[PDB]
Scaffold this active site. Structure first.
Site, PDB file in Angstrom:
ATOM      1  N   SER A   1       0.861  -1.154   0.000  1.00 16.79           N
ATOM      2  CA  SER A   1       0.000   0.000   0.000  1.00 16.79           C
ATOM      3  C   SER A   1       0.884   1.185   0.000  1.00 16.79           C
ATOM      4  N   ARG A   2       0.552   2.175  -0.854  1.00 12.22           N
ATOM      5  CA  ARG A   2       1.317   3.389  -0.967  1.00 12.22           C
ATOM      6  C   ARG A   2       0.619   4.469  -0.189  1.00 12.22           C
ATOM      7  N   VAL A   3      -0.462   4.116   0.541  1.00 11.57           N
ATOM      8  CA  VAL A   3      -1.167   5.033   1.396  1.00 11.57           C
ATOM      9  C   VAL A   3      -0.974   4.486   2.776  1.00 11.57           C
TER      10      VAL A   3
END
Lengths: 62, 50, 470, 499, 56
Positions: free
Chosen positions: D366-368
């Site tokens: 996940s880049r969040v």
């Protein structure tokens, strides 16, 4: 226009013919209500049973 | 209930041949002529409203 | 003779362009007939190129055609005959009996470009088919109205599988079945015809609880596409008009793909991936969508699929893989192990292959089977290099059970009375669930491995244990 | 009669005067009618044929306008008058689509009649810019522990669901929708995510099962099912995610939040392929159109968490990509992988090994990530990432005479692997997710047998529900864990572990 | 009732603990268990006693 004419005429002048009821009967299963879950017999009878059960029993092991 | 639903479809097909009959009636009658004249004047009114 | 008379302009194989006269035009997906001393060639109208020149695809052979040859127009999408007198005869693509059981005594005719049912029409599945075949029943139970799919190598008893299914399920079912063979050997066809006359399902002294539409590979590609469509419409008549549920069987749907890919190219469409038609998805889709459980009936397709070079990464198998609901993978390796079933058990999947819906016990049993086999496969690598002996006791018990289970999945078939001669064995679903539970518990780990090998149910396994014992 | 009612409806249609700009089909092949006429026509304008078929006009060529027919060519014929509908694609948007299974135009295929539609908005529109952005932090909890801890994301954000073909890809997705019921029930409209499942190229029966399941979990009352079925043609399929997105804009614009699950863009691609090849446009890499990237980039950048200034709203998205035999190097995956803010990667071995969810969390990213997720859950799951990391590395050491250190890891790690199993189509409440992971963190689950993990889990939850429902309510309401709360929680876990 | 039937069944397992043999103990316990399980499954499976005529 032609829509009104066609409709008025179509409905009025062409009478529905409803299906033969006999054929409907044919296409359904007829069915008359099921009868009796039966009365099953009274298990064991006479002093055959009484003597058998009293006498046979001693089925405790030593 | 199933045969009833079938009868609704059957009614539509009964009415399908009724459409065919009514189409033949419009195209048979000199309603074919007289209503074309009606269409002509209706188009005249429509196109005049342009 | 329709005043819609067209003259051929270009014979460039299947592509036959016709030059209908001024104003007069047919419509896309219509049917043209050209009278010939080779019956009537049917051309399916597939494009209009305008100027009263259409471009149509041929169904029958195009040899001897005279360029400029008068073409009558049937005027509508190719209409086959349907009835209950379509039951019990082999009907070719152009709706003519090729087994010569006299002319089909048609009730109704319908177009073969009938539209798939709407969302509203579909009636949600819940029925459980059971085939009495242990692998199928336990590890991927089938559902009535399903879209069973026999993905497998080239005729890897693929035909044999279909034969077994027809032998058990079709006969058991009171309803009609429709066996449609697209591009299968005409030798194989004669055997199937004889065989299903033998199983009596085709009774030529009576009616038949099956119809046949055999289109075989020696027919132009265009005709090959619409063998499927032809068969499908008969099934729709059964589903709808007769109301009866059926079990459709089609063979082989890679032939349906292959055929379509070929005439796409001829139609001039830019070939898609691995040369497949750009319209592949929609052609498959129309076929599948047409086949469904409605509030008028239920149709259980079993579609053979040939997976070229056993690669399901090939786009044509992969596209079909999505489109079907009850997949089966038939692996060559398992066939070679001598097990018939040839199924890959971990790769079998079905819409119905739930938990509670297949029964909590069934689910748990199947979870245990899957784990045991998956472990056995995982450990195969360890056994390969390190050796068998470097495994644990728990693992050894698991290996012993897995080998026993592996050969308990083996269930003889009636259609391996032409192979082994050994009479088939078919074990009811409830019985299989119970028997497998026992094995896993190790209640039959006191039974030799070879006493599971190529024998049916638990009674048989025990009996063969006694037989080997003495 | 039904006959009279049908007649009445049809009878009530009369009088034409709309037709003006005609076209005449020159040749109709491949669903690509080519017209000389329609001189003034907008691009992707809706056109109505004589047959009645509707189209968009992708090719506007100097002498012909290449209409793309949305429907079958069966009733279409050459030379046809082509009335000019005069509207570039627009779809009803409004609150009425909640509890509506609709076809692409918007015609309900569940036949729930008229749609409460507060706008007709164009389907192809430009995405929220840099200025329409607020910081992302709003939890998205799918009720799946691995997702919620290992790979969580915020609202308005992308994150791929790239995984193995029909391995309950839809099932993985469906789990989230069910969890959205819990928040949905709550009044707050930041807690009302109005879900949209976009069924692209999917059998009507399959979606019927989906619909039936949704009705069973009563999720229909915030669900919208945009349906482009398998039967529904490639133009509808091409516009299907875009059209769906527009619906999402209405909720988002109202400042509300919603979640749109595009399933699957793999079938969208094929439809575009069909369109492009048929429009004779040169096909891109892996025979998938060259500007398929352009389509995807437009679609996937519309998911946005808007600025507080321009009203805080969101439109979370979760595209689904079907891996063709696990292929992630394929052109459609590679492009999508770049655009997306996270990926979830399902794995076949795990599925076989009975790990359902079969998510391989190593290949999930996940880049969040932790920016959104409950603070409480963050506290008790930093450890979890590290523990699992060791378990993965020491996984291959599982196959003899093994070091004590590795063996300890294996005990903790194996129990965790069992713990992240969840019976699909059952989501969990976060206020009880935090306890389960906490136990694992306190390593009291090390003392629990693998088979007994499952029984332990439900029992532990019930024990917490009776005994420490003060704790459960505190965890929920505080949303954060004080040292005193973690203390009490540990006591409860110890007590339960003892029994 | 049904609770009597099953309680005495399990009671007889622990009575057979204290009295060797269980020759016809198992047959008594089995019979009371059987019909108890049949009627509970009957009453819970139970379709209506009569046809509806409201809707249909």
């Amino acid at each position: 226009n032609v829509i009104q004419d066609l409709y008025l005429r179509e409905l009025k002048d062409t009478k529905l013919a409803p299906s033969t009821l006999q054929d409907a009967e044919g296409n359904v299963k007829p069915w008359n209500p099921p009868q009796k879950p039966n009365l099953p017999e009274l298990e064991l009878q006479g002093p055959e049973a009484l003597k058998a059960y009293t006498e046979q029993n001693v089925e405790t092991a030593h | 209930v199933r045969y009833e639903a079938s009868l609704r479809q059957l009614e539509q097909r009964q009415l399908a041949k009724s459409v065919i009959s009514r189409v033949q009636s419009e195209l048979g009658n000199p309603k074919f002529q007289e209503k074309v004249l009606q269409q002509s004047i209706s188009e005249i009114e429509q196109l005049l409203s342009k | 003779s329709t005043p819609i008379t067209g003259k051929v302009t270009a014979v460039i194989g299947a592509i036959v362009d016709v030059h209908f006269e001024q104003s007069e035009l047919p419509a896309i997906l219509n049917a043209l007939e050209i009278k010939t001393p080779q019956g009537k060639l049917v051309l399916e109208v597939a494009q209009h190129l305008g100027e009263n020149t259409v471009r149509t695809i041929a169904m029958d052979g195009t040899e001897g055609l005279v360029r400029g040859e008068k073409v009558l127009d049937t005027g509508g999408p190719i209409s086959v005959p349907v009835g209950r007198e379509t039951l019990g005869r082999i009907i070719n693509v152009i709706g003519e009996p090729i087994d010569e059981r006299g002319p089909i005594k048609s009730k109704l005719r319908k177009p073969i470009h009938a539209d798939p049912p709407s969302f509203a029409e579909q009636s949600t599945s819940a029925e459980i088919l059971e085939t009495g075949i242990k692998v199928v029943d336990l590890l991927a139970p089938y559902a009535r109205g399903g879209k069973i799919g026999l993905f497998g190598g080239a005729g890897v008893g693929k035909t044999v599988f279909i034969q077994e299914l027809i032998n058990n399920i079709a006969k058991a079912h009171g309803g009609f079945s429709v066996f449609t063979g697209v591009g299968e050997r005409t030798r194989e066809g004669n055997d199937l015809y004889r065989e299903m006359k033998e199983t009596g399902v085709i009774n030529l002294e009576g009616e038949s609880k099956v119809a046949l539409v055999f289109g075989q590979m020696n027919e132009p590609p265009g005709a090959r596409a619409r063998v499927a469509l032809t068969g499908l419409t008969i099934a729709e008549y059964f589903r709808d008009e007769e109301g009866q549920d059926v079990l459709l069987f089609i063979d082989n749907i890679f032939r349906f793909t292959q055929a379509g890919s070929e005439v796409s190219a001829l139609l001039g469409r830019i070939p898609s991936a691995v040369g497949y038609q750009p319209t592949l998805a929609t052609d498959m889709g129309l076929l599948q969508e047409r086949i469904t459980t409605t509030k008028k009936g239920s149709v259980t397709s079993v579609q053979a699929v040939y997976v070229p070079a056993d690669d399901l990464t090939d786009p044509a198998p992969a596209t079909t893989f999505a489109h079907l609901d009850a997949t089966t993978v038939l692996s060559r390796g398992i066939s070679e192990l001598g097990i018939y079933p040839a199924v890959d058990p971990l790769d079998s999947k079905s819409r119905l292959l739930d938990a509670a819906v297949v029964g909590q016990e069934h689910y748990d049993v199947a979870s245990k089977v899957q784990e045991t086999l998956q472990t056995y496969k995982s450990l195969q690598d360890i056994i390969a290099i390190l050796g068998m002996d470097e495994l644990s006791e728990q693992d050894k018990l698991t290996v012993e059970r897995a080998r026993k289970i592996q050969r308990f999945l083996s269930q003889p078939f009636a259609v391996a009375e032409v192979f082994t001669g050994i009479p088939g064995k078919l074990v009811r679903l409830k019985d299989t669930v119970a028997s497998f539970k026992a094995v896993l518990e190790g209640k039959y780990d006191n039974i030799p491995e070879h006493a599971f090998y190529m024998v049916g149910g638990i009674e048989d396994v025990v009996a063969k244990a006694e037989k080997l014992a003495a | 009669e039904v006959s009279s009612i049908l007649e009445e409806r049809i009878k009530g249609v009369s009088d034409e005067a709309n037709l003006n700009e005609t076209g005449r089909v020159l040749a109709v092949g491949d669903g690509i009618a080519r017209v000389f006429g329609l001189n003034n026509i907008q691009a992707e304008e809706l056109v109505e044929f004589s047959s009645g078929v509707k189209g968009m006009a992708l090719n506007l060529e100097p002498g012909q306008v290449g209409i793309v027919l949305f429907g079958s060519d069966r009733l279409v014929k050459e030379g046809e008058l082509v009335k000019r509908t005069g509207n570039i694609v627009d779809v009803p948007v409004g609150p009425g689509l909640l509890g509506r299974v609709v076809d692409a135009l918007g015609n309900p295929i569940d036949g729930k009649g008229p749609i409460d539609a507060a706008g007709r908005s164009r389907a192809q529109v430009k995405a929220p810019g840099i200025l329409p952005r607020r910081s992302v932090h709003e939890p998205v909890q799918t009720g799946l522990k691995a997702v919620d801890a290992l790979v969580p994301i915020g609202r308005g954000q992308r994150e791929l669901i790239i995984g193995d073909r029909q391995t309950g890809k839809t099932a993985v997705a469906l789990d989230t929708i069910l969890n959205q019921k819990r928040w949905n029930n709550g009044s707050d409209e930041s807690k009302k995510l109005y879900c949209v499942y976009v069924a692209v190229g999917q059998k009507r029966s399959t979606v019927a099962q989906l619909v039936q399941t949704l009705e069973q979990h009563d999720a229909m009352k915030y669900s919208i099912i945009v349906a482009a079925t398998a039967s529904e043609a490639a133009p509808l399929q091409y516009l299907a995610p875009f059209t769906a997105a527009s619906i999402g804009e209405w909720f988002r614009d109202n400042g509300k939040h919603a979640l749109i699950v595009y399933d699957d863009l793999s079938k969208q691609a094929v439809a575009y392929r069909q369109l492009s090849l048929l429009l004779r446009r040169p096909p891109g890499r892996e025979a998938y159109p060259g500007d398929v990237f352009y389509l995807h980039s437009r679609l996937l950048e519309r998911a946005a968490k808007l600025s507080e200034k321009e009203g805080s709203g969101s439109l979370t998205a979760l595209p689904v990509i079907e891996t063709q035999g696990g292929d992630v190097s394929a052109y459609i995956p590679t492009n999508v992988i770049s655009i997306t803010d996270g990926q979830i990667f399902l794995e076949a071995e795990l599925f076989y090994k009975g790990i359902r969810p079969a998510i391989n969390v190593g290949l999930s990213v996940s880049r969040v990530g932790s920016a959104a997720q409950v603070k409480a859950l963050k506290q008790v799951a930093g450890s979890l990432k590290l523990f699992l990391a060791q378990y993965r590395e020491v996984a291959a050491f599982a196959q003899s005479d093994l070091d004590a250190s590795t063996k300890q890891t294996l005990v903790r790690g194996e129990r965790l692997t069992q713990l992240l199993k969840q019976n699909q189509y059952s989501p969990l409440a976060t206020e009880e997710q935090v306890p389960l992971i906490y136990a694992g963190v306190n390593g009291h689950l090390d003392g629990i047998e693998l088979s007994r993990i499952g029984e332990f889990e439900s029992s532990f939850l019930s024990y917490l529900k009776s005994n420490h429902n003060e704790l459960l309510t505190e965890i929920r309401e505080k949303g954060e864990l004080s040292k005193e709360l973690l203390a009490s929680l540990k006591s409860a876990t110890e007590s339960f572990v003892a029994t | 009732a049904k609770s009597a039937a099953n309680k005495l069944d399990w009671a007889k397992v622990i009575s057979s603990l204290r009295i060797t043999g269980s020759t016809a103990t198992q047959l008594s316990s089995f019979k009371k268990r059987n019909d108890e399980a049949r009627r509970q499954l009957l009453e819970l499976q139970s379709q209506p006693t009569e046809v509806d005529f409201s809707h249909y």
